[PDB]
Design a protein around this motif. Sequence first.
Motif, PDB file in Angstrom:
ATOM      1  N   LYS A 230       0.796  -1.242   0.000  1.00 50.82           N
ATOM      2  CA  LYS A 230       0.000   0.000   0.000  1.00 50.82           C
ATOM      3  C   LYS A 230       0.828   1.293   0.000  1.00 50.82           C
ATOM      4  O   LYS A 230       0.572   2.177  -0.818  1.00 50.82           O
ATOM      5  CB  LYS A 230      -1.010  -0.001   1.161  1.00 50.82           C
ATOM      6  N   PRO A 231       1.823   1.408   0.905  1.00 49.93           N
ATOM      7  CA  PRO A 231       2.646   2.616   0.912  1.00 49.93           C
ATOM      8  C   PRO A 231       3.469   2.844  -0.357  1.00 49.93           C
ATOM      9  O   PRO A 231       4.268   3.772  -0.396  1.00 49.93           O
ATOM     10  CB  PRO A 231       3.584   2.392   2.103  1.00 49.93           C
ATOM     11  N   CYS A 232       3.279   2.015  -1.378  1.00 52.22           N
ATOM     12  CA  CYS A 232       4.048   2.128  -2.612  1.00 52.22           C
ATOM     13  C   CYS A 232       3.148   2.171  -3.828  1.00 52.22           C
ATOM     14  O   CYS A 232       3.630   2.287  -4.968  1.00 52.22           O
ATOM     15  CB  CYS A 232       4.987   0.939  -2.757  1.00 52.22           C
ATOM     16  N   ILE A 233       1.845   2.074  -3.585  1.00 54.61           N
ATOM     17  CA  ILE A 233       0.893   1.882  -4.663  1.00 54.61           C
ATOM     18  C   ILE A 233       0.909   3.042  -5.669  1.00 54.61           C
ATOM     19  O   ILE A 233       0.746   2.828  -6.878  1.00 54.61           O
ATOM     20  CB  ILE A 233      -0.525   1.559  -4.120  1.00 54.61           C
ATOM     21  N   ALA A 234       1.151   4.253  -5.169  1.00 53.54           N
ATOM     22  CA  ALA A 234       1.265   5.445  -6.012  1.00 53.54           C
ATOM     23  C   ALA A 234       2.449   5.347  -6.973  1.00 53.54           C
ATOM     24  O   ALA A 234       2.424   5.922  -8.073  1.00 53.54           O
ATOM     25  CB  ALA A 234       1.390   6.687  -5.153  1.00 53.54           C
ATOM     26  N   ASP A 235       3.484   4.620  -6.549  1.00 52.14           N
ATOM     27  CA  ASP A 235       4.675   4.444  -7.366  1.00 52.14           C
ATOM     28  C   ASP A 235       4.429   3.328  -8.381  1.00 52.14           C
ATOM     29  O   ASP A 235       4.836   3.448  -9.538  1.00 52.14           O
ATOM     30  CB  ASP A 235       5.911   4.152  -6.498  1.00 52.14           C
ATOM     31  N   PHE A 236       3.732   2.271  -7.956  1.00 50.57           N
ATOM     32  CA  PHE A 236       3.534   1.077  -8.794  1.00 50.57           C
ATOM     33  C   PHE A 236       2.515   1.255  -9.904  1.00 50.57           C
ATOM     34  O   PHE A 236       2.706   0.746 -11.020  1.00 50.57           O
ATOM     35  CB  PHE A 236       3.152  -0.149  -7.958  1.00 50.57           C
ATOM     36  N   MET A 237       1.435   1.969  -9.599  1.00 53.17           N
ATOM     37  CA  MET A 237       0.351   2.153 -10.553  1.00 53.17           C
ATOM     38  C   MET A 237       0.786   2.669 -11.931  1.00 53.17           C
ATOM     39  O   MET A 237       0.445   2.053 -12.940  1.00 53.17           O
ATOM     40  CB  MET A 237      -0.765   3.011  -9.957  1.00 53.17           C
ATOM     41  N   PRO A 238       1.555   3.780 -11.984  1.00 52.44           N
ATOM     42  CA  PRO A 238       2.037   4.231 -13.297  1.00 52.44           C
ATOM     43  C   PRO A 238       2.873   3.194 -14.055  1.00 52.44           C
ATOM     44  O   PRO A 238       2.806   3.165 -15.286  1.00 52.44           O
ATOM     45  CB  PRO A 238       2.882   5.464 -12.959  1.00 52.44           C
ATOM     46  N   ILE A 239       3.640   2.357 -13.345  1.00 58.82           N
ATOM     47  CA  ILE A 239       4.459   1.328 -14.010  1.00 58.82           C
ATOM     48  C   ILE A 239       3.572   0.260 -14.625  1.00 58.82           C
ATOM     49  O   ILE A 239       3.791  -0.165 -15.765  1.00 58.82           O
ATOM     50  CB  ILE A 239       5.481   0.645 -13.068  1.00 58.82           C
ATOM     51  N   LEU A 240       2.575  -0.166 -13.856  1.00 58.32           N
ATOM     52  CA  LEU A 240       1.581  -1.111 -14.338  1.00 58.32           C
ATOM     53  C   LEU A 240       0.905  -0.554 -15.581  1.00 58.32           C
ATOM     54  O   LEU A 240       0.716  -1.272 -16.560  1.00 58.32           O
ATOM     55  CB  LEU A 240       0.557  -1.406 -13.245  1.00 58.32           C
ATOM     56  N   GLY A 241       0.569   0.734 -15.543  1.00 63.82           N
ATOM     57  CA  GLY A 241       0.012   1.429 -16.698  1.00 63.82           C
ATOM     58  C   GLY A 241       0.939   1.399 -17.900  1.00 63.82           C
ATOM     59  O   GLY A 241       0.502   1.111 -19.020  1.00 63.82           O
ATOM     60  N   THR A 242       2.222   1.677 -17.664  1.00 58.00           N
ATOM     61  CA  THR A 242       3.230   1.697 -18.731  1.00 58.00           C
ATOM     62  C   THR A 242       3.364   0.330 -19.384  1.00 58.00           C
ATOM     63  O   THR A 242       3.697   0.228 -20.562  1.00 58.00           O
ATOM     64  CB  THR A 242       4.621   2.129 -18.206  1.00 58.00           C
ATOM     65  N   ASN A 243       3.092  -0.713 -18.608  1.00 55.71           N
ATOM     66  CA  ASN A 243       3.259  -2.079 -19.067  1.00 55.71           C
ATOM     67  C   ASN A 243       1.977  -2.770 -19.554  1.00 55.71           C
ATOM     68  O   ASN A 243       1.993  -3.957 -19.919  1.00 55.71           O
ATOM     69  CB  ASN A 243       3.967  -2.892 -17.990  1.00 55.71           C
ATOM     70  N   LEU A 244       0.877  -2.018 -19.580  1.00 59.19           N
ATOM     71  CA  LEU A 244      -0.355  -2.477 -20.215  1.00 59.19           C
ATOM     72  C   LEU A 244      -0.185  -2.361 -21.717  1.00 59.19           C
ATOM     73  O   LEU A 244      -0.822  -1.538 -22.373  1.00 59.19           O
ATOM     74  CB  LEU A 244      -1.564  -1.663 -19.736  1.00 59.19           C
ATOM     75  N   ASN A 245       0.697  -3.193 -22.251  1.00 64.51           N
ATOM     76  CA  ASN A 245       1.095  -3.114 -23.642  1.00 64.51           C
ATOM     77  C   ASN A 245       1.094  -4.516 -24.245  1.00 64.51           C
ATOM     78  O   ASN A 245       1.910  -5.360 -23.872  1.00 64.51           O
ATOM     79  CB  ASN A 245       2.466  -2.428 -23.758  1.00 64.51           C
ATOM     80  N   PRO A 246       0.160  -4.760 -25.177  1.00 63.36           N
ATOM     81  CA  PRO A 246      -0.126  -6.060 -25.802  1.00 63.36           C
ATOM     82  C   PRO A 246       1.041  -6.670 -26.568  1.00 63.36           C
ATOM     83  O   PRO A 246       1.012  -7.865 -26.867  1.00 63.36           O
ATOM     84  CB  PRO A 246      -1.263  -5.744 -26.780  1.00 63.36           C
ATOM     85  N   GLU A 247       2.043  -5.857 -26.894  1.00 63.52           N
ATOM     86  CA  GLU A 247       3.240  -6.335 -27.585  1.00 63.52           C
ATOM     87  C   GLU A 247       3.927  -7.452 -26.782  1.00 63.52           C
ATOM     88  O   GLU A 247       4.431  -8.426 -27.357  1.00 63.52           O
ATOM     89  CB  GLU A 247       4.218  -5.178 -27.839  1.00 63.52           C
ATOM     90  N   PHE A 248       3.924  -7.297 -25.456  1.00 59.89           N
ATOM     91  CA  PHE A 248       4.500  -8.275 -24.535  1.00 59.89           C
ATOM     92  C   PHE A 248       3.384  -8.952 -23.742  1.00 59.89           C
ATOM     93  O   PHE A 248       3.095  -8.584 -22.601  1.00 59.89           O
ATOM     94  CB  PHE A 248       5.516  -7.607 -23.601  1.00 59.89           C
TER      95      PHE A 248
END
Length: 835
Positions: free
Chosen positions: A648-666
């Motif tokens: 939880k104390p890191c969720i703000a950091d993780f969310m954008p990365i998860l977003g960046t990796n929502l990429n069907p190529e991989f």
Amino acid sequence: KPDEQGLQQILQLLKESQSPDTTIQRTVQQKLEQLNQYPDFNNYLIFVLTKLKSEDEPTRSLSGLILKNNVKAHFQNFPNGVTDFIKSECLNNIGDSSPLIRATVGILITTIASKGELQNWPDLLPKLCSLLDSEDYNTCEGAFGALQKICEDSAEILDSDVLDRPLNIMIPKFLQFFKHSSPKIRSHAVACVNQFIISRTQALMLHIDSFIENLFALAGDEEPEVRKNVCRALVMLLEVRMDRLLPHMHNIVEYMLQRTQDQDENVALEACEFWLTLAEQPICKDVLVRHLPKLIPVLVNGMKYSDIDIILLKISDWNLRKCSAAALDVLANVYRDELLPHILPLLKELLFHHEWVVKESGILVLGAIAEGCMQGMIPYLPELIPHLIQCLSDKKALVRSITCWTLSRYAHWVVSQPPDTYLKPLMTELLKRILDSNKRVQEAACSAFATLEEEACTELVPYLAYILDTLVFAFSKYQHKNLLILYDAIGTLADSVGHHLNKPEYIQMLMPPLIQKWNMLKDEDKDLFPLLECLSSVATALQSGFLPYCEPVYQRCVNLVQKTLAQAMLNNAQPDQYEAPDKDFMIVALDLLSGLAEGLGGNIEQLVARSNILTLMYQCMQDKMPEVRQSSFALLGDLTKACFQHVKPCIADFMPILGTNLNPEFISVCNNATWAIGEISIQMGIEMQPYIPMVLHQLVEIINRPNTPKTLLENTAITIGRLGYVCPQEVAPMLQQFIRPWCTSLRNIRDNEEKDSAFRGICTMISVNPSGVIQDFIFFCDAVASWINPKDDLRDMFCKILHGFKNQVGDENWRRFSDQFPLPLKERLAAFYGV
């Protein structure tokens, strides 16, 4: 002057050729250090210039030969002035009338060219090419021999007029030499032209017919060197220019067939490679049918251990046996059951033969044709398998080891039969062989058992205590090379047996010695990779039972992740001074961690807190290697599920990365990120709000994307469902855009906790924004009708919606709407929800 200390070098050379073995290490030490500035200026006077004065060819040739090693180790420190003198003396004596001297001049030239690259000797290749004509035999041979090694070793070709003539002139010049008197020279000539085959050099491509013609005209040479080169050429051409070999195919085959049983072991192996290459071409099946009657006996005969072979064990990575066996494996996959008429009558002879070399070759054949001719072998299995189980006890080790292998090749069929008939004895017998006195039989048996375990699964449970006794004991008995195979055996056992391994007795004999090694191994050990992979399998089967043992496992894994990242950084900064790591050590450490976080789920919380694991995870999500990202996103979801209080104390950091990796190529990375988001939203509740805008649109885009694997579509549908369940307000508005694929997707999934939360999310969204569903309500019904056993509260949500719609559209329109459904569909909705 050089006359003073020059007679001191020639004396040091004469002493270097002593016979003491004591005066030899002394003169070697004295000479290796005598690398002042100009000893190599001397090292040629001896070798090239002082003929009679200090004659005795052994001495001269040794001068040039010690100097060759000076070129090997300390060439960079070479004075530009001495080298030039070195080079010109060589080329002026390339064709020396003394065989030993010109062979020494030869290896000298070759090595200089290898060490100091292409341009550093610009005069060389032009001079070699020119000398090919020089009308005295020795010079011609000398040049050609040198020229052969240069195209062969270093120099990746692409070298027109780096020779000081076009390849258009050079290739036909080579081909002319195919017709030389000397066997050595026409060998050199075929070897040179062979270098230009694979690269599809245009000059050779515009000389094929001439080449092919000249190859045919040499097929019959005494010199095995020439025969061998012709074969190599024909094997190579098989892939480069099939179109030109094709009209001669049957005529070629008959030559290759004669070559595959050649006097010379080398020609034979080269010829044999032909069958391998041909076997992998679509044209193969039609071309060879007619030759199978002659081919198969030849390959099968080539699969016997030679007399030399046997002695050395009681070998080469590649030989006639390995090649033939490979060809036969491939030919079996091509012809399938149609290969059997050509194999079985020969097999019958081999398997029950009184000479073991013959018997074991037959057992190899039996294993080799397994995958390909499986179906057609089934009728003969009930007698062959019992007979193989018998061979497992053969007095000869080499029969014991191959039988393990062949048996494992039929593992699937064995398990498909009643457990008592074949599986029981096989096991009983294989377990005995795992502890064979002979190392090769140990490996073979242990390896075969691993194959059997994977195929047997549950059926091993009755023998678990005896299986574990054997494997753990093997730890003490085995030495290195065998441990690797034993780890994999243990690991598969955990995979196959599952929870059945979670008992205190089992744990108390298995874990102590595995861990003993886990704390012994120096991080850069071969043993460490399969030990990680094994434990990761064990921790998953030993669910909560793994708890007493996780401390050092977890901690070392975290350490391994950190270190590999650092090392990869160091290597990126300084590709030369700093060395690359094997990122597979990282991926496997992450998988173990996420395996741990799933088996222990919660008890792990203290270890997570006191570690850099999340920071490390973050970096892993930045990585260039998809597999590394994938593994940590997996771990993210697992930690989210296990102990979210530290995520939880890191969720703000993780969310954008998860977003960046929502990429069907991989796909795999996308899958895990999508999965992780979903698990996060369930743990976050309403607080997931600010994070939805960055993630949602990409998911609705991904779910609507035409070519997308089933799993990723399903996971996207679940995650959208879960987000919506938690934030209906933010997700509901988009209901019309994703509902079609969502339903088409989740309609095909088992009634589980995932499908529950997802459908729960769409019900909360439909109730917030009902108009999103109407246009495509047909799809919602199909998705609801897929449920067999929904939770009572969920059935009611389904019930309210289905009725709500029917009330809106009225009894008459509904009746019409329901006609569209298949019968079993109509009927479920009617029985279950009263519509």
